[PDB]
Symmetry: C3
Subunit: 254 residues, 3 copies
Amino acid sequence: TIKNFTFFGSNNDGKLYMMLTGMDYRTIRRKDWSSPLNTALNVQYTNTSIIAGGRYFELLNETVALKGDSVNYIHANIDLTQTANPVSLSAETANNSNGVDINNGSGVLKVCFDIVTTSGTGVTSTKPIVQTSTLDSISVNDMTVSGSIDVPVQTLTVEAGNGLQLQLTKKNNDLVIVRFFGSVSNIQKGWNMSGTWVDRPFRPAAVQSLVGHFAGRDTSFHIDINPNGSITWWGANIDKTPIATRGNGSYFIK
Amino acid sequence: TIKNFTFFGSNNDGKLYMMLTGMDYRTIRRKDWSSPLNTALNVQYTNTSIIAGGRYFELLNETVALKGDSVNYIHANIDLTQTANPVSLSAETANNSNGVDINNGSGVLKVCFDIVTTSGTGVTSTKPIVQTSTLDSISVNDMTVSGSIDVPVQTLTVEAGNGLQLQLTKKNNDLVIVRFFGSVSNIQKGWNMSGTWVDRPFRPAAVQSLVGHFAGRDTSFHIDINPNGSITWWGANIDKTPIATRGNGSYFIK
Amino acid sequence: TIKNFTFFGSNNDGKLYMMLTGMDYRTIRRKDWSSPLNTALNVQYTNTSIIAGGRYFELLNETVALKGDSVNYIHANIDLTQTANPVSLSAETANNSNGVDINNGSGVLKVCFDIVTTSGTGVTSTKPIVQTSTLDSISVNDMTVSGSIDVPVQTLTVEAGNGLQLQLTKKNNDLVIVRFFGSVSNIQKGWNMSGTWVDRPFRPAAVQSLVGHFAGRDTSFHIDINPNGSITWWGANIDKTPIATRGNGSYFIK
């Protein structure tokens, strides 16, 4: 059975709860207080709470019939005009989440919350749909991440002059790894390189010395990336013959 | 008009909601379900929900008069002694958020939620106030960040001895980038440098070998930063003539 | 006195609130609106709100008696059968939080929220219990962290061949720092090294050149970690005599 609570103003409560937890109409809050049971081509939610569109309901021994040999996307369907039974579940061949705003308008909200894969006769795997918190600015003491943090990534290629090539990758507008390529020739120690300066978003607050290596040799150089974006050669003097330059150097922008 | 919901106990609910979402009195939750409309020196909020001091209300075709040629700071003002209209909006010359605790004592809460810039005749730009979630310890599976993560940063300058200087920058109490400055003279391979040891908070769990470069030359060195904070020279033997030492090296503390 | 609000469906509201804020039964939300006051071996909570098992209640001039010369773990205990006073406080010799599910079943929930250390006559220090937010997937504009972010860490040792050892540490499944160990001999420039290739999870999307240093010498080398996991020697030619190889180099996988 489906027990409905945030229903019949309920929409003002719905919006209130949505804003508190940071959810839009394309996600859910979900908790299996008890394990869902699979017998034959069925999923029985024994005790599962769901919040969808800010509306709280409970799935208490609620069984969904599954189609065999397929990926079943389990949906919660909220139709507020259906006074007695506003919430129903369905098993579908695709994620058909529709993001319909049931708190400000009319229509039926569909949200996928479970993915259940079957064989010919039973369930072989289940995967919950991600519960998304959409927040603005967070202040926190400690954080632990079990998967991954995704931060902004910018990339820039600089033809620094004299044949030298920098490939810069910046993450979190702060950490930069520089990869050296190309070949150096016709330059002296302390000379500014004759080509393109580093773009503003990659310029460090303080001068950075990045060490590189001459391919196939036991010799070394470094360049200085200056705050103004210019690059200063600080290897030895190089004559007319180009020498291949390689290596990773890293620096903080801030 | 302004529709009031968490109002008139309400203050117990107010505090409950504040604690659920992690807000204090100096922030809001805000959602424009519909776009605000500008007509000459006015902002009309067509359908905007706000939570301020844990109190939920709705701005439904609510117009705020604006002052010309200035930055207008739009405030929600909550006075619970005014039972018929506890919430009013104002446009002010500065952000005058007062953080007044209306759920525990008397007073009027003022919180800024919007910044609207005008010319002499109309609105030229609007900028929402940030919605802050103040949290303690978070456990998360995945995170995506569209702006930046700010982590703690510690800096240290070490006069390592023999003329060598290290400038260390530590972020997130883990990633360290070291910048070499100064000079080296009067040292042999495997000798610990004769100056200051690296402070406790910058010491790695295991020995870190950091490659440096001699400015204006094609030659190299490396130092070992030992778990105990001492620094071992592992370049060649250097006589009485000082050689300028440069380069970035990075290591993990944990 | 203890004022009980989410009490006497109340279990449905509790679960809803637990889901909104991302709490399980082994943590709390807690706010001292007013400072708790210590006198002799007692703590008076002057105005403290708590949420435990999604149940909101207030500690308003509520005194807990302490045991002398020890570490007192302050618990909120919730027994729903006790209609008139479902919440009580205890000071105990250990953290005895039991995670009992009072919203779906019977039993007494105990959650620790404070740690109070005493001398023979008085309180010497207090320390709150962390408030945990357990979240799934976060999308955020900006974050500021005052403590630390813990990200996944993977560790690998590669016996690269020719005597060379790579110790790789990968964090956030993206940033790798390689530490060189061992010695190199019997290798020519441009030759692939004769040992194990880098395991899949440490392979970069693009070729990475990592600069190394020869211990006790002024000479350098670099290696290329190729996308397929192979390692290419790009130092000079090395004969039968092993030379110790050291240094830190970093790269991004993505």
